[PDB]
């Protein structure tokens, strides 16, 4: 019997930081899982097209940043972008 790959454990970890005593029912897990999959697909597809427009054949972080700047509406964009930058910086130093 094969096995499938989901995002249950990670969502549960993130929940245990911003509400340290409230659980989540399985239906909400299904919804959150599908939501994560959908957003990831949109961003990846947009970045892939955008890289293809300039004749490149790779996906640098810069393309992901531009895709995020294009999708998310308004203030979200700003905040989300900052997060990414910070993270990647802490990854490069190590």
């Amino acid at each position: 019997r094969s096995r499938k790959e989901s995002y249950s454990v990670y969502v549960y970890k993130v929940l245990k930081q911003v509400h340290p005593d409230t659980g989540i029912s399985s239906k909400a897990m299904g919804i959150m899982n599908s939501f994560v999959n959908d957003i990831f697909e949109r961003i990846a597809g947009e970045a892939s097209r955008l890289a293809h427009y300039n004749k490149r054949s790779t996906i640098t972080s810069r393309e992901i940043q531009t895709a995020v700047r294009l999708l998310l509406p308004g203030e979200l964009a700003k905040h989300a972008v900052s997060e990414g930058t910070k993270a990647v910086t802490k990854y490069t130093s190590s």
Partner: peptide, 20 residues
């Protein structure tokens, strides 16, 4: 999605998903 994925992309993308 493309021929070859740079090594900086996954970190950035995971950060964005985590924030949302």
């Amino acid at each position: 999605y493309a021929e070859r994925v740079g090594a900086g992309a996954p970190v950035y993308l995971a950060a964005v998903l985590e924030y949302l």
